[PDB]
Ligand SMILES: [Zn+2]
């Protein structure tokens with residue numbers, strides 16, 4: 413197997429700033445995701461979490477990985493006041509991986525990062 417769930421947990425544990433509260437949620441049959449897509453999911457979470465910094469107030473960073481019609485990752489950051497957060501080279505990385513996977517990516521503003529890709533049929 414891909415150990416996708418364990419790898420998402422490890423990515424959050426390694427890269428989440430200790431000043432941020434985190435929540436990690438999984439929904440759906442993670443075991444159906446193939447190796448290439450699991451690698452993308454891990455890299456997306458690593459990149460998104462490593463770019464999250466401390467805000468003036470206490471903040472929460474939520475990571476949701478869902479397998480439904482597709483694979484979709486939603487990283488929500490309720491922190492405010494940092495318009496340059498998430499706008500670095502990591503954004504190029506996330507967009508590049510979405511194109512690599514034939515999927516899509518959205519940055520919306522707290523701030524929500526959504527990365528999705530189709531599952532192979
Ligand atoms: Zn933040």
Ligand SMILES: [Zn+2]
Pocket residue numbers: 478479480481482483484528
């Ligand atoms: Zn989905």
